[PDB]
Amino acid sequence: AMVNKNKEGLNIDGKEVLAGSTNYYELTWDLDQYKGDKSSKEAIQNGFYYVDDYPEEALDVRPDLVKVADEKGNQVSGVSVQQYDSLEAAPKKVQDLLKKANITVKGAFQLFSADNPEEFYKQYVATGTSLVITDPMTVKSEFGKTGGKYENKAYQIDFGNGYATEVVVNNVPKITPKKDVTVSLDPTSENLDGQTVQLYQTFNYRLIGGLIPQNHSEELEDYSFVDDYDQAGDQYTGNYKTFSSLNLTMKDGSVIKAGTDLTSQTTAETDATNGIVTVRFKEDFLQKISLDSPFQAETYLQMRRIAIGTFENTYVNTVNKVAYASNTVRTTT
Ligand SMILES: [Ca+2]
Ligand SMILES: [Ca+2]
Ligand SMILES: [Ca+2]
Ligand SMILES: [Ca+2]
């Protein structure tokens, strides 16, 4: 058996997992059927292992959180774990036992090993006592820029013979912030990217956040718009508005309609000297969004053009503290 969970313990098999989130896998090292086993010395000496072939393109193991526990919840001594970057890089002994167990891995994998096959056998195997491996891994930050499926595969090796235990699939959504230039808050208004802005004209930078899909695996804790604008040409006026980009369903079942003014659910921080403004969603609001709802929002920063010339803007949308850059807009004065 294999299941993926979030930190709070919810089953998240098949769910959308944001870059930066952790997959708290629980792998059952299933020894129940061996109660009253009568296998030979040589079969026992063939050993007991658990193999997790994790998808290293997408995930990094969190080695400090990896645990092997018995049925009382106590850590198991005499079991160790090593993570290898490939079969080729693995010790010869490891290559050989995988071959014998008839296990194929792709790229990087972990091997959990019974240090002393005879002691492990006497204690857990012949007694039919199953163990639970907690094996947390984090989605690579950069993967959020392309997104896509990943799957975790595991194998159990009993008496040197291996077999597949389970596969769990998840998907990483692609987070793609967008930046437009407007002279209106109407979402249908013309984009002035690539066009002219008059000297001392006010206008908006429209910062459209990335889309968090429904069926996501954990709470949203951060959704921010960080705009380091070019203060040689642009001045932030101190005014902004933030709107929902989609219909949101809250944990209480209420619905916030697309286009609703959510400015009061945000805070703002300015650095005029360095020409930066940051707008962040409040936890009080983010914690109310259903895990089964999408989330997306957009901020209109009111600017003033304050010099002749050509000026660019880019903003960064952070989503649970992973940064994603928007396109770069350009206007001329
Ligand atoms: Ca290693
Ligand atoms: Ca792998
Ligand atoms: Ca829209
Ligand atoms: Ca700046």
Side-chain angles (χ1 to χ4, degrees):
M2 175 190 300
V3 292
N4 190 6
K5 296 182 176 178
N6 68 17
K7 191 180 180 175
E8 311 315 334
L10 177 65
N11 181 294
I12 64 173
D13 295 353
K15 290 191 184 296
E16 303 295 309
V17 180
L18 294 171
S21 293
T22 295
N23 299 267
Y24 297 85
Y25 293 110
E26 294 186 353
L27 315 170
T28 299
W29 197 329
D30 196 337
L31 301 170
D32 191 71
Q33 66 168 130
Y34 300 117
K35 181 166 173 195
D37 178 75
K38 294 200 53 163
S39 289
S40 64
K41 268 265 180 288
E42 295 212 28
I44 288 162
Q45 290 303 326
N46 282 327
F48 307 91
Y49 306 87
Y50 205 90
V51 178
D52 188 305
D53 183 0
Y54 63 97
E56 74 272 11
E57 285 178 18
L59 307 183
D60 287 299
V61 178
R62 290 183 77 178
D64 56 310
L65 308 184
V66 177
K67 276 200 292 203
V68 185
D70 65 21
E71 290 179 345
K72 291 178 156 193
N74 291 319
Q75 282 159 353
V76 170
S77 59
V79 172
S80 49
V81 67
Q82 299 293 315
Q83 179 270 305
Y84 301 116
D85 291 342
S86 69
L87 178 67
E88 294 66 44
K92 181 54 155 40
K93 286 219 171 73
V94 174
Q95 293 168 6
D96 291 342
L97 76 87
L98 293 171
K99 159 203 266 218
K100 184 174 192 165
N102 192 24
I103 286 159
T104 295
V105 296
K106 182 167 178 175
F109 65 101
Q110 290 161 308
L111 180 68
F112 298 82
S113 287
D115 294 342
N116 184 334
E118 179 181 356
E119 284 182 10
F120 183 86
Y121 175 84
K122 287 182 199 173
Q123 179 165 20
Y124 300 117
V125 185
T127 66
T129 306
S130 293
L131 314 177
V132 180
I133 302 164
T134 298
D135 199 1
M137 308 191 187
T138 294
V139 181
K140 289 180 184 292
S141 290
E142 191 70 9
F143 197 59
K145 294 179 178 167
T146 45
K149 298 281 174 172
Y150 59 94
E151 65 177 56
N152 189 45
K153 302 173 187 191
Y155 308 86
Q156 188 169 315
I157 304 177
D158 301 329
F159 309 99
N161 296 309
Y163 53 84
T165 62
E166 220 78 276
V167 182
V168 177
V169 181
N170 284 96
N171 189 67
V172 178
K174 186 180 38 179
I175 306 294
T176 307
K178 173 79 190 307
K179 184 169 178 160
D180 299 346
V181 188
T182 76
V183 289
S184 169
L185 294 180
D186 190 329
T188 69
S189 183
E190 178 179 31
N191 189 354
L192 307 180
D193 185 13
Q195 305 196 25
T196 59
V197 174
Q198 298 298 124
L199 186 60
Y200 306 132
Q201 183 176 355
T202 59
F203 67 91
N204 297 306
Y205 282 138
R206 177 190 191 202
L207 315 183
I208 309 171
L211 193 151
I212 301 163
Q214 59 186 338
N215 198 36
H216 55 267
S217 73
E218 71 185 36
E219 285 295 301
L220 308 184
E221 303 282 5
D222 162 70
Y223 194 102
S224 300
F225 313 80
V226 183
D227 198 321
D228 183 353
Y229 56 90
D230 183 355
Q231 66 271 13
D234 286 335
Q235 184 176 29
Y236 175 50
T237 68
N239 299 314
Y240 75 98
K241 282 291 201 182
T242 300
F243 303 91
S244 64
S245 302
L246 308 166
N247 296 332
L248 315 177
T249 299
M250 315 304 292
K251 284 182 172 77
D252 70 8
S254 67
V255 175
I256 292 171
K257 292 190 170 170
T260 295
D261 185 335
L262 296 181
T263 305
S264 74
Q265 305 291 359
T266 66
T267 59
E269 307 165 46
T270 52
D271 178 346
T273 293
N274 288 308
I276 312 180
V277 56
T278 300
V279 176
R280 304 192 183 285
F281 271 95
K282 293 171 177 171
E283 180 176 9
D284 176 75
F285 183 76
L286 295 176
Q287 79 191 12
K288 294 174 187 288
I289 300 162
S290 176
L291 295 178
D292 293 333
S293 181
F295 181 72
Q296 184 180 37
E298 54 197 70
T299 291
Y300 291 75
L301 298 179
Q302 192 185 64
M303 307 301 295
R304 180 185 295 114
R305 173 57 40 85
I306 48 71
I308 288 169
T310 293
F311 302 100
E312 293 177 2
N313 186 62
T314 311
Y315 95 99
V316 169
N317 177 207
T318 70
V319 176
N320 289 354
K321 293 302 187 164
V322 179
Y324 306 90
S326 73
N327 58 297
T328 296
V329 305
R330 191 182 287 103
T331 55
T332 295
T333 298

